Design a protein around this ligand. Sequence first.
Ligand SMILES: CCC(=O)Nc1ccc2[nH]c(=O)n(C3CCN(Cc4ccc(-c5[nH]c(=O)c(C)nc5-c5ccccc5)cc4)CC3)c2c1
Length: 411
Amino acid sequence: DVAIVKEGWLHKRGEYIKTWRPRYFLLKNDGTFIGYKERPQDVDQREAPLNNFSVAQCQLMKTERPRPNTFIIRCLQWTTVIERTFHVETPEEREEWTTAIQTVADGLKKKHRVTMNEFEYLKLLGKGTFGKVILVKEKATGRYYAMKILKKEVIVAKDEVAHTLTENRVLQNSRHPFLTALKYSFQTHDRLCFVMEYANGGELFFHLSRERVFSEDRARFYGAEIVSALDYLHSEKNVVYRDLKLENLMLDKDGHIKITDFGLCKEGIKATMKTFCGTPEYLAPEVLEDNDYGRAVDWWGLGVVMYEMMCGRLPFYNQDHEKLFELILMEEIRFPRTLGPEAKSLLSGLLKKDPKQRLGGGSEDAKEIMQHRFFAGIVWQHVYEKKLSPPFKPQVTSETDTRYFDEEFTA
Ligand SMILES: CCC(=O)Nc1ccc2[nH]c(=O)n(C3CCN(Cc4ccc(-c5[nH]c(=O)c(C)nc5-c5ccccc5)cc4)CC3)c2c1
C-alpha cells in the first residue's frame, strides 16, 4: 500500500557541490523522500527502499539562513548525522512540506558501563560539524579504536531514548567480516560516542603506494571481499555506502579488507566562491549531478578502487574541479594495454556513466558482478567465511602491534 503523500518541485542544495538545483521530490508513506531532475514515468520501482532517503526518525528544522524559507531534514543513519537542506519560494509551501514530512515520520514510529576513562586518547582522525572522530586505545586490552564523539542535541532530544540508542546499536547486526564493527556505545551529558574497531594492518593507500600496483590476482581478492560486503549492505541492510574509495579501505592483522565507517559530515571549503565538500575523484556521476541514485553508486566506487589497484592511477584526474567534473561526467575511461580483457570488461562495466546500464545496476545487484568472468573460480561462500588465504600478510604479529602507527609509516 505504498503511495505518494506529497510531491512537487523543490530547491535542493547539492550534497558535494553546494549549489541549489530544482528537483521534483516524492514523499511516500513508507518514508522515502527522493528527488529527481524531472518527473519520473514510474511512480514506485519494485526494488526495496533505501534508508539513505528515508524520513523515519528525522528532525525538521526551519531556517532563514543561508537562504529564507529553508527547511532541513536531519537524520542519524548508523553512526553519521546527515543533513538535507531544501528551499521553497513561499513560507506557506514550507509548512505544507514540513507537516507532511512530519506526519510520515510519526506514522512510521509505530566497567559495567563504559566511560571515556577506559580509553587513552592518541590522535585526532577528523573534525565535523556535529562532532569529531579520534583514535583511541582501550587501556585494559591495548586494542585500538576509532571513537565518534557526536553532539547529543543534534541527534535525540531525550536522555532515555539515547540510552536505548546506545543499547540497541551495539547489537543491531553490526557484524559482516569485512565491515568495521561497532563495539561500544555510550553517552556523556552532551556527547554521543560510537566506538569502532580499528584495523592495524595498514591503510590500503599506504600499501598500494609502496607497491605501486597490485596484480590482477591480488586485486581480485580485495575486490571479492568488497563485493561481499556491499552485497550485505544492499540486501540485508538496504543501505548504499556511497563513500567507497581507497582511503576508506584497510587491512586487518591477517590481510583481509575492512571497509571503514569513520566519516563525519563537514561543511566544505570555498572556483573562488564555490563551496566544494571533499574530493570529487571517486564520486559517481549521478551523485555529482544531485540526481536520484541507488545501489549502482557503490559499484561505480568499486570500479574506481579496482581501477587504481590494477593500474596504479586514479581513473579520472585533473587539478581543476571544473575539468574534473567533465572528466567524470563525459570523458570515457581509458585503460593501459597491460590490462587483460576480463579486467577491462569488469572495469568498463563498473564505470558506465548511465547507472541503469552499469554492471550491477539491474535488479540482480551484486550477482551480476559475482557471475562476471573476472571473478570466475571465486567461491563466494568461501569469501564470506574468510577461507581464502590473503595474498599479502601485513607486518604485524598481534592486533596491539602498532607498527603501522609508528614513524615507519613515513616510508
Ligand atoms: C559534503 C558531503 C559530506 O561531507 N557528507 C555528507 C553529506 C551528505 C550525505 N548523505 C549521505 O548519505 N552521506 C554519507 C552517509 C554515510 N555513508 C557511509 C556509510 C554508509 C553506511 C554505513 C552503514 N550503515 C548501516 O546501516 C550499517 C548497518 N552499517 C554501515 C557500515 C558499517 C561499517 C562499515 C561500512 C558500513 C556506514 C557508513 C557515506 C555517505 C552524506 C555525507
